[PDB]
Design a protein around this ligand. Structure first.
Ligand code: 6PG
Ligand code: 6PG
Ligand code: MG
Lengths: 168, 172
């Protein structure tokens, strides 16, 4: 069952916002469980992503459930847990809450212009563009969402995810 | 596909041997991907365990596949990937290798008295004796026929085990 004194934090945000970097460091600094949810795609999703083609909502289905399962498993033994998932749509976001009332989100947030500059192989204008078009920013009705500002170096983004996690 | 330049290490070892703690620290010091596989059991698996009773090889099935899945996914984008998995039985290890030729094991091994005492280092932590024994009654130590398995000696402080999982990962 749910350990309402344990909590799961999902780092959301578009590709390039640095989720896995921040989350990684934040978790090594709170002796927290960390899971990069990209590792939880099924075997097909992986090949389909390597073919050049982007997944659709039906691929995402089993992916989100696994994340949901992992959240459920992480909270049994960890006070705080971090899961990385861009979770760009309300719907994916809710697919994550179903069953885990001890889950909330941390949005590493920036406007398109902010993030491009922050990246600086090579930078891909159109991938980022595609991330923003897919993104459904959490509205006010989404209250389990905490917001963090990426327009700072790593240390600060890191420092502010912590503060955000502590504040609450 | 597989990227044979990229590798996945699975730390195996009875419960209490400190895999997560080690992996977590070896990851961070190396910039690797780290998945604690305790995290990928299916919803029911958790509820079952949430009732006081262990899972059967039946239950582990879906758990091993996801790990296999996860190994497959981590190696697409990570030079080195750390997966934590007890992996007591060969077959489990077999399930893990299947499809993942770029994955080996790092057994951290000590005998009962060493895990007991390591477990007793957490103040006030109750040592569960049958639990550990079972763990040993279950493990099937990798013979020399299983060559993709390196070994690290858990009878030192957490700082060397770390240091020797690295060495071990560097050596090869
Ligand atoms: O626009 C880009 O060139 C990508 O965003 C680039 O940042 C890369 O893909 C990340 O290393 C993986 O992105 P995520 O792990 O954040 O999805
Ligand atoms: O005998 C014990 O008291 C347990 O082994 C104890 O150590 C605890 O459950 C572990 O800290 C969980 O860790 P594992 O991931 O190693 O199973
Ligand atoms: Mg562990």
């Amino acid at each position: 069952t749910t350990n309402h004194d344990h909590h799961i934090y999902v780092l959301m945000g578009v590709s390039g916002s640095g989720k896995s970097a921040v989350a990684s460091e934040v978790a090594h600094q709170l002796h927290a469980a960390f899971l990069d949810g990209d590792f939880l795609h099924p075997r097909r999703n992986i090949e389909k992503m390597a073919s050049g083609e982007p997944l659709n909502d039906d691929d995402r289905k089993p992916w989100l459930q696994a994340l949901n399962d992992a959240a459920f498993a992480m909270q049994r033994t960890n006070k705080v847990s971090l899961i990385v998932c861009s979770a760009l749509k309300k719907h994916y976001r809710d697919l994550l809450r179903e069953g885990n009332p001890n889950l909330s989100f941390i949005y590493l947030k920036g406007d398109f212009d902010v993030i491009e500059s922050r990246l600086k192989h090579f930078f891909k204008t159109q991938m980022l563009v595609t991330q923003f078009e897919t993104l459904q920013e959490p509205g006010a009705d989404e209250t389990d969402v905490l917001v963090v500002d990426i327009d700072q170096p790593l240390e600060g983004v890191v420092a502010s995810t912590i503060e955000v996690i502590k504040k609450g």
